[PDB]
Design a protein around this ligand. Sequence first.
Ligand SMILES: *C/C=C(C)/C=C/C=C(C)/C=C/C1=C(C)CCCC1(C)C
Length: 225
Amino acid sequence: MDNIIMTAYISIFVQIITAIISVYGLFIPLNFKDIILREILILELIVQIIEFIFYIWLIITLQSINEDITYVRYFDWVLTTPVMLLTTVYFFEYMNSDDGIRKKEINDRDYVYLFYICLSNFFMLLIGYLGETKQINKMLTLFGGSFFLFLTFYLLYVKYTKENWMNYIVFYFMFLVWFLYGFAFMFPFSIKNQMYNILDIVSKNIYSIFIFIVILNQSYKLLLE
Ligand SMILES: *C/C=C(C)/C=C/C=C(C)/C=C/C1=C(C)CCCC1(C)C
């Protein structure tokens, strides 16, 4: 009980600092080419709001823990993970387009493909939810969920990446961290829930700060006056 709550606190600590940083990042002036980074940072702040509501609920609920509340995290993830995948797409497009691109052009051109990515991701979460609530066995959950995880990342890779080390860092860091949620699924309640508490820091709040640093680095001259 204790170590779950201590990790929830650590996660909440990073979330609050990250939220403050992201808010200031909204007000950094941007050059034409970098406009989409503020768009990304709005959608990472939306993810934070959903994140936080879950954590507050969690630390209140963990006072009188009578049952296994791991499955409640899916009501978070079913909302946050598609948003996270879209921002990843927008960040890859930013990194990889020679001309300035904005999320509207992306969304109007790619909405069908984006729906396939989010459908694959929804199936991953659905299979996890069925396993996490014991409606299918753990082995079927890990194989079915991993299949869809791989499909989601494959679709992302073949459409939006380029073959270079900046892409590999962003893609494979994300891929590994997401896979580690599947790894956590294998563990008993307390250890599982602790891992998810620390994984959220990496999957959400390190991303936001990264985007913040990219914005600051791109705009520092424009900012300074
Ligand atoms: C902000 C929350 C995020 C990024 C959470 C993502 C969760 C996953 C990628 C979970 C995936 C699963 C597997 C890879 C296999 C077992 C079932 C899941 C749902 C735990």
